[model samples]
Target chain A: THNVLERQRRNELKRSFFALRDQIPELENNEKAPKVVILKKATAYILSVQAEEQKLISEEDLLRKRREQLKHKLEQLRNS
Target chain B: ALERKRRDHIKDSFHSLRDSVPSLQGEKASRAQILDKATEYIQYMRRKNHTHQQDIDDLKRQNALLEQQVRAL
Candidate 1:
């Protein structure tokens, strides 16, 4: 997972986010264009959702680590 | 003190969780790649922004420049 094997299957979702963000400033500058404002709002909302998803992913990782620690402790108890 | 610790623990967990997503650092694109893309978008928008701004400014400047020309005339 640390090498080319992981890199080969790399997801470009974050790049997509950057691309969308890149569009926002340009769209916002179009004062006469109503769709510009709408797109900016939509992109902002999408970013917010991405942040929430990141938070959940982080929590799950911590929980998994704690579970592994407990499993190790149980194994030690049974051996003793 | 116990309650304070509990609150702190929860806050720390939240922050750690937020930072734990390794994909952000995964297969990081070069600064040039990100910056190049960003620059392209910004420059395109900047040109558009400048054009509209110039149009408005030109309308205003036309009156001042005309006054100067008339003085010379």
Candidate 2:
């Protein structure tokens, strides 16, 4: 079942992330202010979090399917 | 997962605070005005905290709902 397309899910999440960033203004120039750099850093940081989340979900789905298959095998043996 | 959530929350709060900084820029104003910038920062932080808590709460509620559904199954 996990042959189900993961690309679509990842793309949807990437779209949401970019859309959310668009709502926030881009850094303005006040060279000494340091806020622009900070905001850019923050944006990158959030994207990293999203990347980590997607990784976890992909791994979880794989592990869950494996467990289910093992359980099905056990059930078949029990019935036989 | 918890560490990831914490990182996400911190990143979100930074974004809100970062957004507030532009209001302080280029405005001809006094020390009082600069102090107001601090006030703005505080307000942004408070809002961020509230939103962060709400997100966590919503996630928890959703998890509970999913668990209930799974139990029914």
TM-score of chain B of each: 0.33, 0.51
Local accuracy of candidate 2 as per-residue lDDT tens digits, B1-73: 5777766765565444334455655554432333345344444544555565565556555555554544454
Interface RMSD, Å, model 2: 13.7
- Model 2 TM-score (2 dp): 0.32
Q: How many residue pairs clash in each candidate?
A: 0, 0
| Tens-digit lDDT string for candidate 1 (B16-36) | 322332332333444324323
DockQ of every candidate structure: 0.01, 0.03
lDDT per model vs. reference: 0.45, 0.48
Candidate 2 lDDT score at position A4: 56
Every candidate's fraction of true contacts kept comes to: 0.00, 0.01
What DockQ does candidate 2 score?
A: 0.03
Q: List the residue pairs that clash in candidate 1.
A: none
Error of 2 at A60 (Å): 1.1
Q: Over 4 Å off in model 2, which ranges?
A: A1-33, B1-73
Per-residue alpha-carbon lDDT of candidate 2 for residues A10-76, written as tens digits (9 for 90 to 100): 5654443343334334422323424334445434544444455456556555555655555565556
